């Protein structure tokens, strides 16, 4: 019929993009980085061990003050910890215990949580009555929520398991904009420092760079061999690192529109659950399924240290805004702080 | 300090008191992951009933012999389950409901059980198998609708097991068919999983009221086996 030529013209466009990328790749990042100083061996020890969660932890998020952190486990509790003194600050019971993500508002007045219930619950923390109460319940996603990030106190952005992302309006409770184009479950999203465009990695070996204002996909990046589990922006906002289940990490650059460096090793065969950069964009921390999270020197593509302690796979890994500590939450109901 | 820091310490202590009060409740209630197919009949199983936003809701709570069970019936996500199923690897058991009357889709069901059984995350989770719709299968195979060899040729040489227990005054053919279907699932179960997890097969209908009792008995067996494994006895 007439639809047969659609696929062939699409694959000429794909070949054109591929050859343009190949032409624009005159050299490699490894060639430029032959004569740079290696970071060396980074040995970090656990400074604190936050105990009190009953089940496996899936997500955590630091505060903008880099002192208070929210953690979400399968026992049905969202626990807000004071990391400096190990003291607990809040313990919010959740309606649905199957929570896969959590977020902490930049202003600190709100938190968010979502999971298999397909509802993003937004909780107020600075209420007059003192006791925390649910402030909003955003619904409209036909798949499970996998990640959510606060743009500000009024609007949030979430990614669901129905190959969609959504930018909401908390005051009203309606999807302000929707982002479509992925062919698989959108596992993770990362917001740029300017909060003008965010990236989303899905279960099709694809990470898409969107536009919160335009509402249309700006760029698409493939190259991974399997589904991508976690992504994060580079500190400057011009690049992002994607960790997938094919036991490798990849650094994508928006301007170059293609991969720069790949982090992989023969011994590691397990996938990457979480990934986050350091404060200077020189030390990449990635969590694996082999019960520990290797830290990668994300400029020469080699291991520069290994964390330990966790008796199960590490599910979440966050870094403070001032770069003073790294929190790792695994499936042993323990959240360690490293410095 | 002791002016505002003491308030933080006492708050943390009240939080911790509640977190211990409810740890007991959390650990004394069993969680169950219920799943099947659209034609399996899991909806009528969910009507045990001893104790919304038009999306997501998958909650069921029941209680027997003063112990509580939380049955979860995921019925809003997409077809690809390879990602959210990881959430259910700390569950006490996985209930698998299969319709044993539609032979056309029975192969799809065997493949489903297989992928669940060999999944990396659920390689330690026991499976309670409900061969639902036995009443329909009785007339499906008793009459001349279709014969199992049209989809499963191994039924030609199959013989009924010696340990099989029929029901009084009823034709052996349906017993042969149901034990055949059972054994295909049980072959898959025993192909892998040496002693980490086991499969409990049950013959159930849409009018059975003792399904909760079966789940309770299988849960006691699973818990006792886990306790014995911790002591390295079995």
């Amino acid at each position, epitope marked *: 019929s007439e639809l047969d030529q659609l696929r062939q013209e699409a694959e000429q466009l794909k070949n054109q993009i591929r050859d343009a990328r190949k032409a624009c790749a005159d050299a490699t990042l490894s060639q430029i980085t032959n004569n740079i100083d290696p970071v060396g061996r980074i040995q970090m020890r656990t400074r604190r061990t936050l105990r009190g969660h009953l089940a496996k932890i899936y997500a955590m998020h630091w505060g903008t003050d880099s002192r208070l952190l929210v953690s979400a486990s399968q026992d049905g509790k969202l626990i807000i910890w004071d990391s400096y003194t190990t003291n607990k600050v809040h313990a919010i019971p959740l309606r649905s215990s199957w929570v896969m993500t959590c977020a902490y508002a930049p202003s600190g007045n709100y938190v968010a949580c979502g999971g298999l219930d397909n509802i993003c619950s937004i909780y107020n923390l600075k209420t007059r009555e003192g006791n925390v109460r649910v402030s909003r319940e955003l619904a409209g996603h036909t798949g499970y929520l996998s990640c959510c990030r606060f743009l500000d106190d009024n609007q949030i952005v979430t990614s669901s398991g129905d190959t969609t992302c959504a930018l909401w309006d908390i005051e009203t409770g309606q999807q302000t904009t929707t982002f479509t184009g992925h*062919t698989g479950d959108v596992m993770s999203l990362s917001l740029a420092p300017d909060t003008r465009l965010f990236v989303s990695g899905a*279960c099709d070996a694809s990470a898409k760079l969107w536009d919160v204002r335009e509402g249309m996909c700006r760029q698409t990046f493939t190259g991974h*061999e399997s589904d991508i589990n976690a992504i994060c922006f580079f500190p400057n906002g011009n690049a992002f690192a994607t960790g997938s289940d094919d036991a490798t990490c990849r650094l994508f650059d928006l301007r170059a529109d293609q991969e720069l460096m790949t982090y992989s090793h023969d011994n590691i065969i397990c996938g990457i659950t979480s990934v986050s950069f350091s404060k200077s964009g020189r030390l990449l921390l990635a969590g694996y399924d082999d019960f520990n999270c290797n830290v990668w020197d994300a400029l020469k593509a080699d291991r520069a240290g290994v964390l330990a302690g966790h008796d199960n796979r590490v599910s979440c890994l966050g870094v403070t805004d001032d770069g003073m500590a790294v929190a790792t939450g695994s499936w042993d109901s323990f959240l360690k702080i490293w410095n | 300090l002791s002016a505002e820091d003491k308030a933080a310490v006492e708050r943390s202590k009240m939080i911790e008191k509640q977190l211990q009060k409810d740890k007991q409740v959390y650990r004394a209630t069993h969680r169950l992951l219920l799943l099947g197919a659209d034609n399996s009949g899991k909806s009528t199983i969910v009507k045990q009933m001893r104790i919304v936003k038009t999306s997501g809701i998958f909650e069921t709570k029941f209680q027997v012999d003063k112990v509580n069970f939380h049955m979860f019936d995921v019925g809003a996500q997409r077809d690809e389950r390879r990602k959210w199923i990881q959430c259910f690897n700390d569950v006490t058991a996985i209930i698998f409901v299969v319709a044993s009357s539609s032979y056309n889709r029975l192969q799809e069901a065997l493949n489903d059980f297989k*992928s669940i059984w060999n999944n*990396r995350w659920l390689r330690t989770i026991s499976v309670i198998l409900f061969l639902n719709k036995q009443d329909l299968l009785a007339e499906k195979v008793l009459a001349g609708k279709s014969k199992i060899e049209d989809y499963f*040729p191994e039924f030609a040489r199959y013989t009924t097991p010696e340990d099989a227990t029929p029901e009084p005054g009823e034709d052996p053919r349906v017993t042969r068919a149901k034990y055949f279907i059972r054994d295909e699932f049980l072959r898959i179960s025993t192909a892998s999983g040496d002693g980490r997890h086991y499969c409990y097969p049950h013959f159930t209908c849409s009018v059975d009221t003792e399904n909760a009792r079966r789940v309770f008995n299988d849960c006691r067996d699973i818990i006792q086996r886990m306790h014995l494994r911790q002591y390295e006895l079995l």
Partner: nanobody
Amino acid sequence: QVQLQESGGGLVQPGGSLRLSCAASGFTFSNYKMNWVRQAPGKGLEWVSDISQSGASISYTGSVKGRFTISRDNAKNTLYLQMNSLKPEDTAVYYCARCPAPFTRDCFDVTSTTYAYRGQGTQVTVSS
């Protein structure tokens, strides 16, 4: 960018033998367990055959047991399905799938449309 391109097929008399070929590009072929599935008109996707990384573990659907054979060529990054004794009920689009997880024995791929690592299919049919 994964790409599973399949060839072969065509209208043949019942009882024939066809050698469907699957070429994989974009991933290490030897690290994944491959699969052959079929979509018949009217009904949905159904799993047919599988082959492990080395090629030792081989299982078939009972409806096509013994009649079809599967093989893997790691040197050419290719998958072969050789078909004997065709039947009118085997008229289906044949998809070549992968496994999402490498170095694993179990994965879910018999799912409906919008599965990433699956080919476009080849329409193979038998004469009356």
